[PDB]
Amino acid sequence: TTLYENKTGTEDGYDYELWKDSGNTSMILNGGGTFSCQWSNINNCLFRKGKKFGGNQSYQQIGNISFDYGCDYHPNGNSYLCVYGWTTSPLVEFYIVDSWGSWRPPGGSPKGQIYVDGGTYDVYETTRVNQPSIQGNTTFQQYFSVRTERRTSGTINVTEHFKAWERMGMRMGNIYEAALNVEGYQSSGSANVYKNNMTIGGS
């Protein structure tokens, strides 16, 4: 229930992962979607809990996807706190970022704004040509919604970001996974996800 090295698994209905390329990481797996983590001397690391979806379905088929979450979030350098996931056909890596450390991701310039869940989100898109992905080295898009001001608790209605992105011409494939995610880059920090209730279904 405390992880220190790369591991993926499932507990209490939530898929979890700790991953780092190097450095010190720890992750306490608490009930349900909740977890606690710390990192130092890392290059890249991530800690996440959510779901790898069991079918090959669109978000209209899966039903509502939302995270009712709360995190006591103390990054010491580069870091962000987000919902993270992928779609396939088309292949998309997506991010809904609510807070960050020293650097607000992803860089570049937004193409729109979404007013949802009491906040304003900047929308970004990238193409990454022949780069590592969940389907090997290949080309994929990245979609980002990044809050204009930091917050660390509330509801992220992922379905509404999906719908807004599609209205802005950003096609969603079948949903592969979605998880509440803490990232670190060349930094130290800690975060306690004390609440993470992931809705999957219905309207």
Residue numbers in the entry: 30 to 232
Text lifted from the article:
The four domains of Xyl include an N-terminal GH11 xylanase domain, two family 36-like carbohydrate-binding domains CBM36-1 and 2, and a C-terminal CE4 esterase domain. Xyl exemplifies a “beads-on-a-string” protein where the individual domains are “beads” each connected by a linker (string), with each domain retaining its individual function- making the synthesis of novel super enzymes for rapid and efficient degradation of bio-waste to biofuels within reach.
A two-domain construct, GH11-CBM36-1, previously cloned and biochemically characterised was structurally analysed in this study. Single crystals were obtained after three months using 10 mg/ml protein in 50 mM Na acetate pH 4.8, 0.5 M (NH4)2SO4 at 18°C. Diffraction data were collected on beamline ID29 at the European Synchrotron Radiation Facility (ESRF), Grenoble, France and automatically processed. This structure filled in the potentially missing information from the Xyl-GH11 domain above, which had a low completeness of 87.5%. Interestingly, the GH11 domains pack to create a hexagonal cylinder around the C-axis providing sufficient space for the CBM36-1 domains, however, the CBM36-1 could not be located. While the lack of electron density for the CBM36-1 domain could imply that the linker between the domains was degraded during crystallization, this is unlikely as GH11 would then presumably have crystallized in the same triclinic packing observed for the Xyl-GH11 domain above. The hexagonal packing of GH11-CBM36-1 has a solvent content of 69% and a Matthews coefficient of 4 (if GH11 only is considered), while the triclinic packing has a solvent content of 38% and a Matthews coefficient of 1.97. Thus, CBM36-1 potentially adopts a random orientation relative to the GH11 domain within the central void of the GH11 cylindrical tunnel. The 33-residue linker between GH11 and CBM36-1 is three times longer than the linker between the two domains in Xynj.
